């Protein structure tokens, strides 16, 4: 099916506590595969998945050169940001960037992204057309004017359409048994009574990949939208999730948990029994 | 490892002020007397050196209190350089202060005073100054600092300093500042003259939204006006010569567009 490659980077100023710190991570789908961390000793791009570990030395030299270049650029953008927002040099600030691309099942380009945030809020983003920019406030309007005057969207478009998709396709083959895998959830239910007249039914999903999944509770068909928890990493490359509902004692049989996942041939309908 | 930093700057005029802060989890200070606490073992807690004197010049590390041990390992090295102790050197840009993006420039510091070392400092950068040995030729000592490949981070206001042999951290008064400007890659604007180039006013216009224009003769600065026809212009009132102009944006005074095409006033 469809796939995506994303690079996420975080720049943090910490006056009086350290030099500005830069962390970048590369993902294919929900699977991290590289990192660079400025404070670390390697000062280079490191593999974080087994299937990228056999890229040659020139790959790591090339990638290290680019992410170190990014590190310098985003640490200056912190300084610029102080001027645009007229903020003092004593505060700590965060500059976040995401870029990457999606391909469809056929390996063709579907979407590309190149966006920035400052202090947890949108700053500027390349539009779907890969030709124009969305500026989120008056400071980014400045950046927008600069980037239009530099005609830089052209360079983003050439990377997103060429370099980025080409890489994504290569990785999908390199890590095929792991990236194009599909682990179904192992499911079960717990029951705990809350009071003399109510009880908690919790429907569980464990060990699944990819992270996308639907847990829903229906009471006699109508979904009683309930407590959902954010899908969490197990730490081995699979994910976990649960959904709970509060039910009138003597009614557990009316309630059914529904599990939808790409690893499942048919969606699961689980009913509690003691 | 504690993080040591100087504030506001490790390069500080005599009579100015600098604070050494030592961030850990009370702390003591050391100078490269590696194991001897400074000031007879003072526990600084809240070090505000003020007014700074030449005794404050030095290469410093700190350790902070650590009861469950009772001190931390030494901090990172911060070199406090005290300026204003000799007459100033001269700073020269070769080929010139306007540097095309990606290209290189030599900043040459020289003096009739015989300095053993030269330092080059971009104003407002917390980076350690670049240091070079003074080379001797024809009554002057000099140093060629290579700057580049040019990009926004390298543009700005520079000063250079000299120091003598036995007091390497006691710097001279700063040279006169030199503004190093990166040009490009923003789209070059158009230069014209009113009524014309033979005689006058020089007009700089562009479809790009520059907030300032800069006219340079073979500089001068003026704010652009939104004008009309969606054009940002500026008019500089003036024996003629070769003129160019460059666009510039708010809060970025040291980064300019590609130069306009040359225009000759005769």
């Amino acid at each position: 099916g469809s796939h995506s490659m994303r690079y996420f980077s975080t720049s943090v100023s910490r006056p009086g506590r350290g030099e500005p710190r830069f962390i970048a991570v590369g993902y294919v789908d929900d699977t991290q595969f590289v990192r660079f961390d400025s404070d670390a000793a390697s000062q280079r791009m490191e593999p974080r998945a087994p299937w990228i570990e056999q890229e040659g030395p020139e790959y790591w030299d090339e990638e290290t050169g680019k992410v170190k270049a990014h590190s310098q650029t985003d640490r200056e953008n912190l300084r610029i940001a102080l001027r645009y927002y007229n903020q003092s040099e004593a505060g700590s600030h965060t500059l976040q960037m995401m870029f990457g691309c999606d391909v469809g099942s056929d390996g063709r380009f579907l979407r590309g992204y190149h966006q920035y945030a400052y202090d947890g809020k949108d700053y500027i983003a390349l539009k779907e057309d890969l030709r124009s920019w969305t500026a989120a406030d008056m400071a980014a309007q400045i950046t927008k004017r600069k980037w239009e005057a530099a005609h830089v969207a052209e360079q983003q478009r050439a990377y997103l359409e060429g370099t980025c998709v080409d890489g994504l396709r290569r990785y999908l083959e390199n890590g095929k048994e792991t990236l194009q895998r599909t682990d179904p959830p192992k499911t079960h239910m717990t029951h705990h009574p809350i009071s003399d007249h109510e009880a908690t039914l919790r429907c569980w999903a464990l060990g699944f990949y990819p992270a996308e999944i639907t847990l829903t509770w229906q009471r006699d068909g109508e979904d009683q939208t309930t407590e959902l928890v954010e899908t969490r990493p197990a730490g081995d490359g699979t994910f976990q999730k649960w959904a709970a509902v509060v039910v009138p004692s003597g009614e557990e049989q009316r309630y059914t948990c529904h599990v939808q996942h790409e690893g499942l041939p048919k969606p699961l309908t689980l009913r509690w029994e003691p | 490892k504690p993080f040591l930093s100087a504030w506001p700057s490790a390069v500080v005029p005599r009579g100015g002020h600098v604070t050494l802060r030592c961030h850990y989890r009370n702390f003591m200070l050391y100078k490269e007397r590696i194991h001897v606490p400074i000031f007879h073992g003072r526990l600084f807690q809240e070090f505000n050196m003020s007014p700074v004197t030449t005794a404050h010049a030095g290469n410093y590390t700190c350790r902070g209190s650590h009861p469950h041990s009772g001190w931390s390992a030494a901090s990172n090295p911060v070199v406090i350089m005290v300026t204003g102790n000799h007459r100033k050197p001269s700073l020269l840009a070769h080929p010139g202060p306007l540097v095309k993006s990606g290209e290189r420039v030599i900043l040459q510091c020289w003096s009739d005073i015989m300095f053993e070392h030269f330092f080059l400092h971009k104003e407002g950068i917390s980076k350690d100054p670049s240091r070079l040995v003074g080379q001797i030729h024809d009554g002057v000592s000099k140093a060629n600092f290579s700057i580049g490949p040019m990009m926004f981070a390298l543009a700005g206001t520079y000063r250079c300093y000299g120091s003598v042999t036995h007091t390497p951290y006691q710097l001279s008064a700063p040279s006169d500042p030199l503004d190093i400007v990166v040009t490009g890659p923003y789209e070059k604007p158009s230069l014209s003259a009113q009524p014309g180039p033979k005689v006058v006013t020089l007009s700089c216009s562009s479809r790009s939204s520059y907030d300032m224009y800069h006219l340079s003769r073979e500089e001068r600065r003026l704010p652009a006006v939104r004008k009309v026809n969606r054009t940002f212009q500026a008019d500089f009132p003036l024996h003629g010569g070769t003129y160019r102009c460059f666009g510039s944006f708010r809060h970025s005074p040291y980064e300019w567009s590609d130069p306009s095409d040359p225009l000759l006033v005769s």
């Binding site: 970048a24 590369g26 990014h70 953008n77 645009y84 370099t163 980025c164 | 990009m151």
Partner: peptide, 9 residues
């Protein structure tokens, strides 16, 4: 494959 990020705000 990383992108060259060279443009300042």
């Amino acid at each position: 494959t990383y992108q060259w990020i060279i443009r300042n705000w």
